[PDB]
Amino acid sequence: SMKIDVVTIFPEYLQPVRQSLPGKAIDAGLVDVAVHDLRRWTHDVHKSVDDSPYGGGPGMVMKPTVWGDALDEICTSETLLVVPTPAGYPFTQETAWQWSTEDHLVIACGRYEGIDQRVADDAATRMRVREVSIGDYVLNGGEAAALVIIEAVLRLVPGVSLLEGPSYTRPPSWRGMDVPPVLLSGDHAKIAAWRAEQSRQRTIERRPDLL
Amino acid sequence: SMKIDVVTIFPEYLQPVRGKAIDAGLVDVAVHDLRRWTHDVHKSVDDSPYGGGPGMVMKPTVWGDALDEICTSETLLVVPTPAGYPFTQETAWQWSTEDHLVIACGRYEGIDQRVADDAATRMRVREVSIGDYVLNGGEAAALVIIEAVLRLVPGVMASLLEGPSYTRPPSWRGMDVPPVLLSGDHAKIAAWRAEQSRQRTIERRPDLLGFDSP
Ligand SMILES: COc1cccc(COC(=O)c2cn[nH]c2)c1
Ligand SMILES: COc1cccc(COC(=O)c2cn[nH]c2)c1
Ligand SMILES: COc1cccc(COC(=O)c2cn[nH]c2)c1
Ligand SMILES: COc1cccc(COC(=O)c2cn[nH]c2)c1
Structure with missing residues (x-):
């Protein structure tokens, strides 16, 4: 039994792995994958999710206030918070095996430059947080990395x-x-x-x- | 300007390309159902491996027909596989200047090696790994490669x-x-x-x- 929540500003991106699930898997409560639009947790009329980086330099950094609210609502103390990023620890087959027995994965999809570091720092004081890279390349967002991770983990979950x-x-x-x-x-x-x-x-x- | 063709038995899974919206016309991405080149009644694309082993191997005949129609001598044939050479940022830069990529998505335990060997006699072929894990199929890996490459194409850190x-x-x-x-x-x-x-x-x-990994 595993729950996966994905938070992203492109929830439609994750719709293929939603339907990739066997009907006999979700009906058995062995797996449920839920996708959430990050903008649900934005505060302004413009639904802002990023802002300019402290200390300058082209690029945008995702807002901690928005991410913090989202994770506050979705995460539990049992949650394994996965953050795909090219700056992360390597995600390998051993990782997928380890994560295959988790009860609850939350995957936070960030956009290039990244997410304000305090988000992960704060979360790590009440849950387990794993920043991971699926490979030495840069993507525009974490969404494709989430697909990879979800697939590599779930195929090790018996019956899914x-x-x-x-x-x-x-x-x-x-x-x-x-x-x-x-x-x-x-x-x-x-x-x-x-x-x-x-x-x-x-x-x-x-x-x-x-x- | 670049054309990317993706070949898969799960074309639905490639809907996420719609994202890196090529509305700017800097690339055309086409997705093809491999079963379109079958002749069988049940449209079989796989079979048991010679020499024994687990799972099934994708048949070479179907793939050969598909690649014949879709590739030219100028095509870069990309085959995601955990047994491939590493796909890295350097590879992304290199492929960002290509006219034509064709990405062959495999499933099960793999594609009959003769598919790649045959193709290599008329086009450049690159079997590549996007990382050291195993997937059910090449589809997600194709998505990763497309994203990494397309954001480097002119007109759109290692x-x-x-x-x-x-x-x-x-x-x-x-x-x-x-x-x-x-x-x-x-x-x-x-x-x-x-x-x-x-x-x-x-x-x-x-x-x-340049230090030992933990
Ligand atoms: C050595 O291999 C590679 C390849 C590509 C990127 C990286 C690291 O990139 C980042 O940390 C990053 C880039 N944007 N935000 C974070 C390493
Ligand atoms: C969350 O912070 C960032 C920053 C920059 C890019 C991304 C998207 O993830 C990747 O590009 C990636 C994941 N593994 N290898 C590459 C996330
Ligand atoms: C040591 O690093 C890793 C980790 C995970 C997988 C692999 C390679 O697996 C294959 O070569 C393969 C699997 N199916 N067909 C070919 C290497
Ligand atoms: C050639 O056909 C096959 C065979 C086995 C798996 C796959 C899917 O690709 C991967 O799993 C992969 C790619 N880079 N890292 C992992 C395709």
């Missing part, structure tokens, strides 16, 4: 070292290229060693950092 | 992590903005920010400064 080498399926011959004959050999010990070497070679070529 | 940012009010729930940021001293602000950045990078990403 090296790189892997190439995979093949039918036909055995296609556009002049044959499936590696070892895979059709019925020698499963040999297949395993073949696959291990394929993985070692691909990892060396693509991710030497992993060795 | 080595360190950026430090914290603040805005009004100068005090909030008893928490004050760092006084230096209120001081109007550009040099001291630059110095403090540079320091916060380095301090955050060593704490969260020691690898970026």
